[PDB]
Design a protein around this ligand. Structure first.
Ligand SMILES: [Cl-]
Ligand code: NA
Ligand SMILES: [Zn+2]
Ligand SMILES: [Zn+2]
Ligand SMILES: [Zn+2]
Length: 120
DNA sequence: TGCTTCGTGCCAATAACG
DNA sequence: CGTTATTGGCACGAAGCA
């Protein structure tokens, strides 16, 4: 037992018992709760670091390999993560990649074995 | 104050089951 | 191998940090 619920205007929110963060999804509360319980460990397969969420380890491991999955479509430069790509496109191209038009391509991950999304 | 990492709704892909 | 149950990839704003 790791949560209680709160219902406001007919909307259900799941509240973590330890820190009282609220979640629209019970799956998000569970993913978050590992930060408290450390029931599940996600150790980096290249260094000593251990993370409480799978996605923190994955994004960390890409720094080890150096794969540059985020490609600017305006000039072709590639970047290790969304933030570098977004900042490049905003400052060099004066355009916002968030939604609207598709200014970048996310290539599949080939330097690690992670789940493969067919839309890439 | 610009890099660095975190965080969470959404949901597709993979794990689990026996 | 057939479904479903669960994980975790992703965006991109938030937070951390020097
Ligand atoms: Cl690359
Ligand atoms: Na968001
Ligand atoms: Zn919590
Ligand atoms: Zn590492
Ligand atoms: Zn560019």
């Amino acid at each position: 037992d790791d949560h209680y619920e709160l219902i406001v205007d007919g909307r259900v929110y799941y509240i973590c018992i330890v820190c009282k963060r609220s979640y629209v999804c019970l799956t998000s509360l569970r993913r978050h709760f590992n930060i408290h319980s450390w029931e599940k460990k996600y150790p980096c397969r290249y260094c000593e670091k251990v993370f409480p969420l799978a996605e923190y380890r994955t994004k960390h491991e890409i720094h080890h390999t150096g794969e540059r999955r985020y490609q600017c479509l305006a000039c072709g430069k590639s970047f290790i993560n969304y933030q570098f790509m977004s900042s490049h496109i905003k400052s060099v191209h004066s355009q916002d990649p968030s939604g609207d038009s598709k200014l970048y391509r996310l290539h599949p991950c080939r330097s690690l074995q992670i789940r493969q999304y067919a839309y890439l």
